């Protein structure tokens, strides 16, 4: 076992979809998987194993923030032998290159965290996803007719930012959106030789203040779920 997961070793398939919100994980298990079994529930952070088009797939919640994400991803890789980790979530757009309902593939994750300096010699770690996984996402999106937006995201320790004046500067350097875990997902997978990728759905635009209707939010997140499950099968 671990302190944060009470699944049996072997309960997880080697491919795992992750979301910060464990109720979104539950929703995916119930709506999209066949024969879905809840396999962990410590701290109400739910994980499941089921089948998608006959393919075994696991789902796991990771909470909010780099430190929370790093706990679960570390345990999934080191204890539960998970090999491929696809994070899907929402993000707040900061770039004119993206709009509401877009799906972003993060080919880099910048951060205001100290975690990668602590990991990496007090230097600048370029936190990046597995290239083959990003290729698979691109080819699957084209097959599904999804216009995948590709660029960096900014992973913040702050949901309520003290640096909103800086969003334009991040957009200048090709940061399409802000979220709070990708840099930790990527650095952990890099450390532990696992394949990881982050996709995020634009439900809010932090510049133009636009926001999706609650029904639209379900629809756009559903399209992201289908993309994720298709690239893992």
């Amino acid at each position: 076992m671990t302190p944060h997961i009470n699944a049996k070793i072997g309960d997880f398939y080697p491919q795992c979809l992750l979301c910060g919100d464990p109720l979104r994980v539950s929703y995916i298990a119930k709506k999209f998987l066949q024969d879905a079994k809840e396999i962990t529930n410590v701290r109400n952070m739910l994980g499941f194993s089921g089948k998608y088009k006959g393919r075994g797939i696991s789902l796991m919640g990771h909470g909010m923030g780099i430190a929370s994400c790093t706990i679960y991803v570390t345990e999934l890789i080191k204890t539960y032998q998970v090999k491929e980790l696809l994070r899907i979530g929402t993000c707040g757009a900061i770039s004119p290159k993206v709009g509401l309902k877009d799906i972003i593939m993060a080919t880099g994750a910048s951060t205001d965290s100290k975690t990668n300096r602590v990991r990496f010699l007090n230097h600048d770690l370029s936190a990046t996803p597995d290239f083959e996984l990003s290729l698979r996402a691109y080819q699957t999106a084209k097959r599904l007719g999804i216009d995948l937006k590709v660029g960096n995201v900014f992973s913040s320790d702050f949901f309520y930012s003290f640096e909103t004046h800086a969003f334009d500067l991040m957009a200048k350097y090709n940061h399409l959106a802000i979220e709070m875990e990708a840099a930790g997902l990527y650095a952990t997978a890099m450390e532990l030789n696992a394949k990881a990728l982050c996709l995020c759905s634009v439900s809010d635009h932090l510049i133009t203040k636009e926001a999706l209707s609650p029904k639209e939010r379900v629809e756009s997140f559903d399209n992201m779920i289908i993309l994720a499950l298709e690239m893992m099968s």
Copy 2:
């Protein structure tokens, strides 16, 4: 409502106990409170309001890590008008002065996070609790005959540490244990002029290699919980 709490304004009493684990919050509501009502459940992060010896008290989960804690504490203060926040968490002992299941009161919370440098001019913010709450904790512990251990804690972005060499230095500087939220609780309550304190029970021990099960991390710490409820009565 906030993006992470779906309570109505006014559902929270001005005094609130916090745990990272919403199931420890649920345990406390069911075991120790009268007329307890679940008031929020976004992302499965439960919160409750109820009575202890006729006094209204709220409970709220804050998830794992400074970024998660800061989100919930910020919303509790600014939207739900919470005035006193008492974290009753778990921690890993690094000092030979403390043992498994000891209760520590954090007179300061050091950190490897960048959040306080971002908050505070890139200088050293010494994150500290409210002194009146600390005095109340000390006096209540004396009244109840509880041996309260008092010192700093170190709040890390890492549970699985890359600086295991460094725990002895931490302990030398009177850090009794490591956990992952106190510095964020303290800095947020400082920012927002609210009263906060962190108590934690030792669930893991660097020196003895003891570690509690997930069930024990919920159920083994009634002495902490009773201390907290008695402080807020």
Copy 3:
């Protein structure tokens, strides 16, 4: 001996009151102690041993700035076996919560120094006083009818600040006043397992530009001296 103190080992009592100004130390020895003996005078930095209400008490000057304070405190603890160190001084108020003649108890000391990053793994050390000593100060102040103001102070390397625009931000985070040694006193005592506390008297308000009359400055500092000597006896 040491390079900076020429007292005999054993000349110091285990409890020592400190001030930056050695002439203030001399004043205390002459006005408040019985049988006071000058025991060190290297670099004109005077220290004394005498009796207060039959209690042996030492006094020692520590100069200005964290680096100066750290030299004397290190020597007092390691060579002269001093166990409890109470620093009293003036400070410049930056918070609307305090006014001229207030006495502040510093339960944390933030800093713009690099000293604690050098001491503490390049992380954020929360520099804090000994809790039991702060309890003793609080109980003694209540016995004497002193309205003790409690909060953080900011210990600066700069008397003539280049960051005056930032005072409001420090006051927001519960820094009541600025001085130049507390963070070094606290970190040194933490390193060396000694008990330390800092009190400071508000003789100037850096925001409202108010300032005490020279006679008022003597009176307010006298009240602080009495509080200190009473808590050590």
Copy 4:
């Protein structure tokens, strides 16, 4: 004209290959291009324009180190309207996954430079290439039967390193090799909204202690050069 390029505006095609060594640039012009013309030679840093299979392609030297690279890339983009920049450099292998003369495509460029902290709010900029160019490189390599190694590189300010202990950690985090310009190329192209990619051939090997001669660093990498020209056709 610019202080470092004496070409006429319009002399550069929109697609440009880059090497740190202007004599590798000269070699490519003479060996692989039709109707090649030298278009700039300030500071002996040569650049050319010519044709490959009827398609116009430019070549430009960028010197050694991030500061040198940033100068030339900034001018190529802002003054000479270059749109796509493909570095084909050399690097020192630090990972057992790669061997001498292997071709690496840098999916990210970590660094010990301060340039990106200066650019990017003192946070961590994850310096990354254009994804479309990366896909083009991958697909062209597959078409040509070239075994393209894919991972991060570490861009250092040092060729003769003071952190030789640290190469193993770099390699653990999937840094295949060390070189000295990719992070600057990537950050400058991000700043200026241009498409950039870095390929490098292994000219030195940490583990085997192999190292090529200066002549071999010009002449030994035709497979890299052909990959690059085929990508831009």
Copy 5:
């Protein structure tokens, strides 16, 4: 008057010798100057004005550490119109090129302080003396037959060091000795457009373990003192 000097404006000559120890300043006044008058004594930090071979020269103590030194130097320049400041201090040798009682002239002062990063855009300020004063020191030493050692010093916030491993690296980079004020003297005089130089005599030796008594640190360095007075005549 200033908070730390109670001289009248005009009491200081434009040329001033500085020591950290006010009793070394007093020693110089009594032993080497004609008609010496004590002009300031706040906090027992003495200063004098007198004549050497008919030329007016002032002396002033600056206490221990960069923060203390910066206070006195700032006031001497801005209020008392001092133009040339010559520190004649003590230092701990870390290089085998120097021996006990050697006189070092600090061509640069490296530091572990944050003060210069705070002053200077968070970049590296290379703190250096006035070149004309350095030339004067060199030429006067030659004239007097004094073997002046020339190199960098390292100005630390610590006398009792936590980086004893690091002294050999310091010495490799031509740091002959460690002391605690030169970088602050140099940075303050740079800020304020005044001429400053630091000479120091070796009072402690890392390699031989030699260390002088407090009395010897006042009385053993007449050769330094005579060099300084001859330079300012």
Copy 6:
């Protein structure tokens, strides 16, 4: 050999003049040296050995930026046994104390590079030239009737600065001009126990926007060349 120099060991004289621009090195060899032999040309970075007034002197190009300069200087010292390195170049004035055509002697080199923090314990290295060499430059300039301007320079990683608002602050702290290599030259020579000095010619004033005519630029650089060759003979 080395990767970046193809001269024979022994081809270099122990005294070497350096410039960033290898065509300026060529110009010096052709116009001012007797019997000049080109001895290296890797990457078109030319170096020469010849005679000046019967004195053997070498010349070597070092490219732009600290990282480039550090490669060549390291190789010159460690492989080719060069003992004295005099860098001459142009610089952009930022101080009212200097004007067009002035020659500056840099007695310190500040920087925005991370290189000296990486070299030097994450502290502040005061990067300084060899004092005897600076003496020789001063005495030679006086003999030649040159009004040598003496002060710090600022060595930047950025030719196209993002911090132009800060030039006035650097001028305040006695930075007379900006260039891009001196801090690296100085730190490398300090590490490796070689004698180094940087002179620079003011061809542009970055404040007043003044600029020398192309013919004046040749004349002023010629005067600097003569000063350099005279101090090495």
